[PDB]
From Swiss-Prot, chain B:
GO CC term, one of those recorded: nucleoplasm
InterPro entries linked: ELC1, SKP1-like, SKP1/BTB/POZ_sf, Skp1_comp_POZ
Quaternary structure and interacting proteins, as annotated: Heterotrimer of an A (ELOA, ELOA2 or ELOA3P), ELOB and ELOC subunit. The elongin BC complex interacts with EPOP; leading to recruit the elongin BC complex to Polycomb group (PcG) target genes, thereby restricting excessive activity of the PRC2/EED-EZH2 complex. (Microbial infection) Interacts with HIV-1 Vif; forming an active cullin-5-RING E3 ubiquitin-protein ligase complex (ECS complex).
Subcellular location: Nucleus
Listed name of the protein: Elongin-C
Organism classification: Eukaryota, Metazoa, Chordata, Craniata, Vertebrata
Domain of life assignment: Eukaryota
From Swiss-Prot, chain F:
Protein name, entry field: Elongin-C
Gene Ontology molecular function: protein-macromolecule adaptor activity; transcription corepressor binding
Originating organism: Homo sapiens (Human)
GO cellular-component term (any): nucleoplasm
Gene that specifies this protein: ELOC
Pathway: Protein modification; protein ubiquitination
Record-stated family: Belongs to the SKP1 family.
Tissue specificity note: Overexpressed in prostate cancer cell line PC-3 and breast cancer cell line SK-BR-3.
From Swiss-Prot, chain G:
Organ and tissue specificity: Expressed in the adult and fetal brain and kidney.
Impact after mutating residue 96 to C: In PCC and VHLD; type I
Gene name linked to the record: VHL
Pathology linked to this chain's protein: Pheochromocytoma: A catecholamine-producing tumor of chromaffin tissue of the adrenal medulla or sympathetic paraganglia. The cardinal symptom, reflecting the increased secretion of epinephrine and norepinephrine, is hypertension, which may be persistent or intermittent.
Phenotype upon changing residue 16 to L: In VHLD; type I
Consequence of changing residue 59 to L: In PCC and VHLD; type II
Consequence when changing residue 10 to K: In VHLD; type I
Any GO CC annotation of this UniProt entry: nucleus
Effect listed in the UniProt record for changing residue 8 to W: In PCC and VHLD; type II
Domain topic, free-text comment: The Elongin BC complex binding domain is also known as BC-box with the consensus [APST]-L-x(3)-C-x(3)-[AILV].
Reported impact of residue 101 to P: In PCC and VHLD; type I
Annotated effect of mutating residue 18 to S: In VHLD; type I
Full protein name: von Hippel-Lindau disease tumor suppressor
Origin species: Homo sapiens (Human)
Swiss-Prot record, chain K:
Protein's organism: Homo sapiens
Entry protein name: Elongin-B
Domain Ubiquitin-like residues, every copy: 1-66
Pathway of action: Protein modification; protein ubiquitination
Lineage, broadest ranks: Eukaryota, Metazoa, Chordata, Craniata, Vertebrata
Gene3D superfamilies reported for this sequence: Phosphatidylinositol 3-kinase Catalytic Subunit, Chain A, domain 1
One example GO MF annotation: ubiquitin protein ligase binding
Localization per Swiss-Prot or TrEMBL: Nucleus
Highest taxon in the source lineage: Eukaryota
Subunit structure: Heterotrimer of an A (ELOA, ELOA2 or ELOA3P), ELOB and ELOC subunit. The elongin BC complex interacts with EPOP; leading to recruit the elongin BC complex to Polycomb group (PcG) target genes, thereby restricting excessive activity of the PRC2/EED-EZH2 complex. (Microbial infection) Following infection by HIV-1 virus, component of a cullin-5-RING E3 ubiquitin-protein ligase complex (ECS complex) hijacked by the HIV-1 Vif protein.
Name of the gene this protein is made from: ELOB
Family: Belongs to the Elongin B family.
Length: 148, 92, 99, 103, 148, 91, 149, 92, 148, 87, 104, 109
């Protein structure tokens, strides 16, 4: 599963936030429970101490919207070669127009008022289904049981 | 080739075929049996919306498979709801 | 039914376009994951036609509508051929099943 | 570098890209391809200023940073009637309804 | 000492040019001879299809000025973990004010005219010492015989 | 702490000590026995020493710093005199 | 898809021989027919390069993006190897038009922002500014193949 | 059979007819349509340029369709601009 | 075994002599008998009309020394693709120092005087054994029966 | 590594091992970084090395190979040396 | 392209290659590797003049057209007596016999 | 003799350098001609480290000098095909030096 395996071998990493959003780095612990870490402001980049085999995930600190790291969903630092730091490039994905619209509506209207918008109930349900690290982790497991 | 999307108010939008196909609904309407005809009419989508729907096609086509940073696809509050409606109908 | 199912699947494979080239070899055998890890990360239910000939002998497909459901699945899983094959399977089933 | 454009005449709007280095003439040819009217029957405007067939989109003022795919720059189009050209007329897009109370 | 390693295991990489300059990626061959590759325009990124253990280096295609990849001088792709691509972030280093000035003077004055500048003799030599991949490789070897 | 660098024409430049120490030659002049806050450059004009400070600002800021650094610009008009000044200082 | 490589699956050994005075940029057209830059050949060099048959290549001056020739033509497509023999791509200067050749030299001596300072016609200025380009030339080559068809 | 090209400063250049025809402008000027004209006069082309224009004709004729290797046609900076002008006028 | 094949399909070819020597193109006929053809001066190239499957061989017209075409000993034009001509690049091989010395001695001393050189008897025989298309064809056959 | 070939007149020639091995007779003798040739003078053994340099460099070179020059004055003695060496 | 060189101090002659681009110092290091004497104990001469550790072989004069594998360019070497770095000594190669009348 | 021939061939294969990496890993199995057609156009007599274990069981090598003649042949075949200074070149130089010390320990001690 999404194990984040104990290594004891340090892996220097550079978290580079090239999204327009505030980024929440999320480290999966050894039990595989998401752990929130300090947020990266848009257009910032810092050297962070992680360990080899440790599994990370990144998200919009506010909306919990899904981001990408090196054009994929999970980042696992390789063992450093000759001390060279690994690079985690965090970016927006190309959201579907729908999901993107939901994002904007959700950002403008209080959740208790979703009910007041003159839209179809199905859209209201889609608004109510806020993005979520755990839901997405469950999906990523079934995508690994499907590669089996 | 290019394709013509026509809004309720009757604006014509000429966009590349591949750009339009980003929409499953449009893909269906064009690939459905001259065959694969140029025009499609949206009686319930106004121009200020269908204009922006195209702008998304432009965006999606361009920035899918772009390796470094992608920029936010902006949506103004005033248009957000009608776009969400249009977006869902189109499947884009 | 097995004689009819073979006539439809063999016509789609043997089918050459108007330059003489056979379209099916790029669907006859799926690649290994070692070779191309991107198809097995992006495509949910990978199936080739050798896996369709396998399921015609094992009798997993109960009707000619169940054989079609998984030829549309791989063709939906060369840009035009993914479609030409769908268009040559939809004319091959329409000749064998009713004539 | 790429520039993203809306070429608009009346109620017609063409969405296309072109290079900064590409020329006003090459753009007229793309329009010819779509609206079936030659470059000598077309006038292309950036805002209210007429664009010479020989200048690069770059030189006209169009840049990658102001002609982004989701914020395309608008090139105005006018066709010729006989000895005279029609006025540049770009019929505006529909207005959105007043912002619903929650927002 | 300083060469690619024949591996036969593919490693997808992302060359990201975050320098203001045109970047010349330079692949060290197995023999360890620098090999020029296609240039990256400023602010561009490409997926590259390299191999495990292959050693790369980046430079200003014009001036042959030294650049950095992941805040170091050499980039060597790790084997991909779960199909995730490695990221090579190419940037300007913080050049010394001197070296930076040399760069500008060198870019304005033809090398045969360095002689005409009303400057100190040492500077004439410094302007003449144009940056060079091979000189830098020789330096990097002695820096690797000094760390063993 | 702020240090005072004084140009030939006699402009005063007040810059942080840490920013200034980027110049090895200034480090020497300050850490030496002397008789400090001030250092005087009789052969460096203001339009040059001004830009030398701007470099200190730049160097200090964009070092120990990771994802992207911008080009330190130098106009042709100043390039030669700056190169001279730059050499005379450690960088 | 008009001018594109073909997924042959059959490897072809090739020898890129640069007999031009210029640094050569080999450009492989992919299956979609999008130019793909490959490592440059220094003048007077030759390399054996692993390729596949039906693959379509194209060569240019890595610096100026000027047009080159391979076996006295514009495109190179390797034949299937016969008995292991490596096929040979001989890359040379073409005979440029005097105009295009002059443009090349002027372009190489004058900074693009100074093209404006030359006492020449505006049309010539536009021609100087127009820099040769793989894509423009590919578009032309297709119209030259639809004109033969 | 040869042709006479005359520069502004009044130098005469005798070059093969076929060599000269490499210039569209010259071909036009040579080809009263009962018989051929030997002289053509260039009011605005000096000798040091028209001399080199001929050298190109020599080069083009010789190396066009030559199989193994062609050498670059050299142009000195001093002549480059005026030659470019002349080149464009001639269509060579 | 080593012969041209009557084909009816033309294959235009470019014979490029990048040896310092005058080159004798040698076409193997259908029966497989060497046929001398017009010589190529050093540094010349010609377009020649040949046919698919036709087998060629190149040699120093003067000495009958062995040459190479596209880094091998035999040239067989493939079917032309899109009318573009195939290219035959003719070059020196790397002769053994011995064979190369023989070449030079043979070129300086009349064959009747090989006997006057104060050398080993074996060398006299080697000197007298002038290179020869037929001897080399026999060798090339046994090298193709050894690959089967 | 490198290998030392010593001429009759006693000149020393230090050449890469792999360069030298191009000679079957040297290959045999080294099968030890020294070999002594009592019957080969320097002006010959010098040129024998130059051939090793040439052969090693140009073997498997696709574009073009240059003729390995031998002056008349040296030709016979080189031919002798060549045959003895098996180069 | 590379440059092909013979370094000939006294009786000794070293056959080796280097890059057109590379440095006189890197060459001294290769000599160090073989003759076991560091770069500060050797000075290398092209003809009668010494080459500085810092120069590119190109700037010294060595190119493809003068330093070919079959015509290596000859670089002079001087070794150090503790008191003085010894003056450049090269030992001439054996002479070839007068050209026999048979080859005229 | 077979016990001695296995001790020498297994020591050369199992031999790791002073960074812990096994050198014989690339030499264990020659590639297919489809994979690499150049090796089989240049190399005259292609042989690997499993084709030597094959000929130790079939008893084709009559002495310890016939086993050595074909370990030098592949190590020299490899050296020719590869670039000088390559990873694979200098290990066939070491695999000849570790075979010449492995035969010298087993055959006389
Ligand atoms: C500024 C900023 N901005 C945006 S984000 C950010 C930022 C990012 C990071 C940090 C901080 C500083 N960094 C982190 O949070 C990093 C990142 C991510 O990687 C988790 N992590 C951590 O620090 C965890 C962590 C640390 C650790 O270190 C062990 C490998 C090394 N330890 C010694 C010993 C070993 N193990 C040895 C056997 N041992 C056991 C042995 C046995 C046993 C053995 C034999 C026989 C019988 C036995 O029972 N049994 N049990 C054992 N259990 C323990 C185990 C320990 C561990 N690894 O992970 C921390 C948070 C948990 C700050 C800002
Ligand atoms: C030093 C130097 N200096 C100057 S130049 C140079 C130099 C030059 C070259 C190289 C290197 C060594 N060489 C190259 O770069 C060469 C050159 C040129 O020839 C292209 N090329 C390449 O490497 C490309 C390349 C590789 C490839 O191999 C295919 C046959 C095979 N692969 C790809 C296409 C996949 N296909 C796999 C099924 N796949 C599908 C299958 C199915 C499917 C569905 C249902 C059932 C069954 C099925 O199989 N469905 N969809 C599929 N999608 C498409 C298809 C793709 C496998 N051909 O070209 C590389 C770069 C792309 C080095 C230096
Ligand atoms: C657009 C753009 N923009 C900015 S950059 C850029 C760009 C990016 C990429 C490219 C192109 C497409 N890509 C490249 O240029 C890449 C990049 C960089 O990494 C070099 N490279 C290359 O392609 C080299 C290359 C290719 C290769 O492929 C082998 C791994 C696959 N080979 C099968 C066989 C195996 N080896 C197995 C043992 N084998 C030997 C075995 C033996 C032996 C074994 C047993 C017993 C006895 C024996 O002797 N001996 N010798 C052997 N040697 C061969 C070896 C083969 C590996 N690896 O590297 C090319 C250039 C060389 C373009 C632009």
């Amino acid at each position: 599963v999404l194990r984040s395996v104990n290594s004891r071998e340090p892996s220097q990493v550079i978290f580079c936030n090239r999204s327009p959003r505030v980024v929440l780095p999320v480290w999966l612990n050894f039990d595989g429970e998401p752990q929130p870490y300090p947020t990266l402001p848009p257009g910032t980049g810092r050297r962070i101490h992680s360990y080899r085999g440790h599994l990370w995930l990144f998200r919009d600190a506010g909306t919990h919207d899904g981001l990408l790291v090196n054009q994929t969903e999970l980042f696992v630092p390789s063992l450093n070669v000759d001390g060279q730091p690994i690079f985690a490039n965090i970016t927006l994905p190309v959201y579907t127009l729908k999901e993107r619209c939901l994002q904007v509506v959700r950002s403008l209207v209080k959740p208790e008022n979703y009910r007041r918008l003159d839209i179809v109930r199905s859209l209201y349900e889609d608004l109510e289904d806020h993005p979520n690290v755990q839901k997405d982790l469950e999906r990523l497991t079934q995508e690994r049981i499907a590669h089996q | 080739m290019y394709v013509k999307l026509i809004s309720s108010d009757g604006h014509e939008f000429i966009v590349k075929r591949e750009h339009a196909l980003t929409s499953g609904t449009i893909k269906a309407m064009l690939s459905g049996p001259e065959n694969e005809t140029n025009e499609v009419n949206f009686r319930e989508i106004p121009s200020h919306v269908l204009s922006k729907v195209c702008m998304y096609f432009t965006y999606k086509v361009r920035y899918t498979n772009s390796s470094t940073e992608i920029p936010e696809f902006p949506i103004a509050p005033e248009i957000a709801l009608e776009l969400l409606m249009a977006a869902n109908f189109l499947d884009c | 039914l097995t004689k009819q199912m073979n006539a439809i699947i063999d016509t789609v494979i043997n089918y050459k376009d108007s330059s003489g080239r056979q379209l099916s070899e790029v669907f006859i055998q799926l690649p290994s994951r070692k070779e191309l890890p991107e198809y097995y990360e992006l495509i949910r239910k990978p199936v080739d036609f050798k896996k369709i000939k396998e399921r015609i002998r094992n009798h997993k497909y109960r009707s000619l509508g169940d054989l079609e459901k998984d030829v549309m699945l791989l063709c939906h899983n060369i840009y035009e051929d993914s479609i030409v094959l769908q268009s040559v399977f939809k004319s091959a089933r329409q000749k064998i099943a009713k004539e | 570098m790429d520039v993203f454009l809306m070429i608009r005449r009346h109620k017609t709007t063409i969405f296309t890209d072109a290079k900064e280095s590409s020329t006003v003439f090459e753009l007229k040819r793309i329009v010819e391809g779509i609206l079936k009217r030659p470059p000598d029957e077309q006038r292309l405007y950036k805002d209210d200023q007429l664009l010479d067939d020989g200048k690069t989109l770059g030189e006209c003022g169009f840049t990658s940073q102001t002609a982004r795919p989701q914020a395309p720059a608008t090139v105005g189009l006018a066709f010729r009637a006989d000895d005279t050209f029609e006025a540049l007329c770009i019929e505006p897009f529909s207005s959105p309804p007043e912002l619903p109370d929650v927002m």
